[PDB]
Amino acid sequence: GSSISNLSMQTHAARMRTFMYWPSSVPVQPEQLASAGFYYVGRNDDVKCFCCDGGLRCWESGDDPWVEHAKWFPRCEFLIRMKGQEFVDEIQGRY
Ligand SMILES: CCO[C@@H]1C[C@@H]2CN(C(=O)[C@@H](NC(=O)[C@H](C)NC)C3CCC(F)(F)CC3)[C@H](C(=O)N[C@@H]3CCOc4ccccc43)CN2C1
Ligand SMILES: [Zn+2]
């Protein structure tokens, strides 16, 4: 079937609902994370992408979830369709 890792998390609205217990101390906001395909897994500040199942943690002030998505998980289909291969190639070219 579908390549999507977590079908229940395919909508922005559903991803946002997972952030009810997101610690307010974390400098990155639920809106920025959910927009970039991430949902909260309920431990610390751990998030996973609904499409590629890539996990990120230890968010710091000034982190851009889209940039982090492209840095670590460049072949994610959701990332490529939302931001484009040109964006992914640019981020990848920094490393
Ligand atoms: C073999 C290839 O490994 C790459 C490295 C990259 C780092 N990363 C991360 O999440 C990194 N986070 C960041 O870069 C954050 C978003 N900005 C500072 C790590 C930065 C150093 C640290 F010590 F703080 C720990 C977080 C992710 C990560 O550590 N994810 C963990 C491990 C796998 O399981 C989960 C599950 C949920 C959430 C996170 C993770 C994915 N990693 C792949
Ligand atoms: Zn992804």
Q: Domains of the chain: which residue ranges? A: 1-95
Resolution in A: 1.8
49 is in an annotated binding site: yes
Angle of CA points 90, 35, 77, to nearest 5°: 55
Report whether 15 contacts 32 (CB < 8 A): no
Domain 1-95, CATH 3.30.365.10 — does that match? no
* Residue 18 identity (one-letter amino acid): T
* Residue 93 identity (one-letter amino acid): G
Residue nearest to atom 16 of ligand 1 (CA): 59
Q: What tokens appear for 40 in the block?
A: 């909260």
Kind of pairing, strands 38-40 and 47-49?
antiparallel
Classified as helix, coil or strand, 38 is: strand
Would the CA dihedral through 44, 49, 52, 56 be positive or negative? negative
Q: What tokens appear for 18 in the block?
A: 């997972």
* Contact residues for 39 (Cβ-Cβ < 8 A; gap 6+): 6, 9, 14, 15, 18, 19, 33, 47, 48, 50
Give dist(CA 22, CA 5) in Å, integer.
Answer: 22
* Contact residues for 4 (Cβ-Cβ < 8 A; gap 6+): 10, 50, 51
- Cα of first residue to Cα of last residue in the chain, in angstroms, is 34
Report whether 61 contacts 54 (CB < 8 A): no
Provide the Cα torsion 73, 78, 84, 90; round to 10°: -10
What is the Å distance from ligand 1's center to 93 Cα?
A: 19
Q: Which of 5, 57, 61, 94 to mutate to test the pocket of ligand 1 (most atoms within 8 A of CB)?
A: 57
Give dist(CA 92, CA 72) in Å, integer.
Answer: 9
Classified as helix, coil or strand, 31 is: helix
